[PDB]
Amino acid sequence: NLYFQGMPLCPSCEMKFNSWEDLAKHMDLIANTNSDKSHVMWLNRNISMKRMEVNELANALERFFSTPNSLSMWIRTRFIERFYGDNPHPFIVAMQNPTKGVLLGYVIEHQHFLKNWVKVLSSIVFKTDKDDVLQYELENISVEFIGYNGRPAHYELLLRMGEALGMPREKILSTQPLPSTQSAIKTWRKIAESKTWLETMASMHSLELVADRSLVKYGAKLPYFNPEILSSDEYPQAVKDFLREGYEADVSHAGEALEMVEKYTEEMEMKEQVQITVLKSFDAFSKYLLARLERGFEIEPSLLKRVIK
Amino acid sequence: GMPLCPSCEMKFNSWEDLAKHMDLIANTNSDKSHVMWLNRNISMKRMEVNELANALERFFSTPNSLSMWIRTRFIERFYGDNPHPFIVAMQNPTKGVLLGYVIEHQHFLKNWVKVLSSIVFKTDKDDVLQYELENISVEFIGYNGRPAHYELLLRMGEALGMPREKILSTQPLPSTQSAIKTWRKIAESKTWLETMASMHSLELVADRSLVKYGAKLPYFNPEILSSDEYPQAVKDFLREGYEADVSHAGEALEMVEKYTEEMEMKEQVQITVLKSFDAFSKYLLARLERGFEIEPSLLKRVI
Ligand SMILES: [Cl-]
Ligand SMILES: [Cl-]
Ligand SMILES: [Cl-]
Ligand SMILES: [Cl-]
Ligand SMILES: [Cl-]
Ligand SMILES: [Cl-]
Ligand SMILES: [Cl-]
Ligand SMILES: [Cl-]
Ligand SMILES: [Cl-]
Ligand SMILES: [Cl-]
Ligand SMILES: [Cl-]
Ligand SMILES: [Cl-]
Ligand SMILES: [Zn+2]
Ligand SMILES: [Zn+2]
Q1: Distance in Å, CA B66 to ligand 6 centroid
Q2: Class of domain B1-303
């Protein structure tokens, strides 16, 4: 019935296979070659560190793409596993009680991220054939540009945060992204250029889960930052002003986007292709979050020393 | 240096060689494209290669300023000796003319914001990105408290007796769809600069300054903005372009001219802009055609 529709794609090279067994055989063959890096990295990051038997891997691959069943829930679970799991992202660990350097590293690399964000959302506006998707993304772009009804845009709030931390706007804007922000931006741009608007929507809005304060309810071992920062006299008001935005908005915002992603993925019968691309966006986001931290290292040598202690 | 064919985009060693090519292809049964281009831009009557070479060279090089060239070509095309039938009907518009405008333009405005969004994604120029985001934001939220152009259009239709539900459920006419497809394909396949010129050049339709450069008619009788003859919602919608598009089209074309010089693409942008004029002429004819379907007495007034 779903015999030919249920034929699995390689999550690394995107080749199609007749069964989970054929995919497992392929992945095992390519990963056990000197030349390949991509397939072994994918298996290490998502399945296991130790080498599995083809049938063992076939069952592991099937369980990984079918559980959780809900795409919205699958995206949420994989995001937590990757960034808020047993080994949370080093940027998130540093973000718990951030130094001036952590926060400036955030400002400097995120200014570039926000420029790419509004451009990639604009490609969705152009390529989508769904009015609810177009309305949603135009609201998003408008709020990233002029802000919400007189309030400043997230971009302006970020620049104001940097200025409050002692870095003039002129210096922030003239600072080129670090290589991993560039690499991440290139990946997201190529997703927006070559993939479906639905894949692009899932790839970008899944990242908003980083500031979703509900994540701890689903297994996140840490918040994005210590919520005490939003009330203590320890940080400038501009820091509180910027961080409070994601703190009140992204729980309902990421939820609404992923709800639409789940709906159209069912209609267009593209669950695995969307799952593959979201994982690829997760690899870009981790690199980009590293760039934020490494920018912090440039400003604060003690921050590098602490992370590697 | 080699002129490009404005129809098939092939390159030629001289204006004489392009004129020879165009004359050869236009004087074949199979071709429609080359003869229609010559009819719409140069002349109705056949020319010998030499007079066509001079006519082509003059058409593409005069005015020298791209901004002035887009403006001059636009006026000749839509506000010349034979102004567009929609513009003639728009002088003192009936309920049918205005509803035809509302019905087909809602689809135009949806395409507009999507095509401008492709420019935001594809441009590498910050002033272009800033300009287009301000445009999209204004088409979505409105300017200085006021409702967006799109909301004002729907309100105009509602004031003319057509409920919003009926306006929104009306599919575009085949010619609106055809024109939208042309603009979408320009946005997909051409450079962001070509796409910017192709779309913002259309804003010249509501540029109230055009009569200063020789337009034979305004977009509509400016008296409409003050008379008690039309509902306030009509005045509210038409007031926007009247007020804004003179400075808006100017600012866009100024940027188009700047980046066209930097990227040395004058003729390519000129070609694509004229392909956009063809799509716009089709789309304006669609507004009028919708007006016929709604107002039986309208066809006699045009014929
Ligand atoms: Cl589930
Ligand atoms: Cl790279
Ligand atoms: Cl698509
Ligand atoms: Cl303060
Ligand atoms: Cl230090
Ligand atoms: Cl001149
Ligand atoms: Cl620039
Ligand atoms: Cl067509
Ligand atoms: Cl381009
Ligand atoms: Cl009234
Ligand atoms: Cl040039
Ligand atoms: Cl009638
Ligand atoms: Zn593979
Ligand atoms: Zn030709």
Answers
A1: 9
A2: mainly alpha
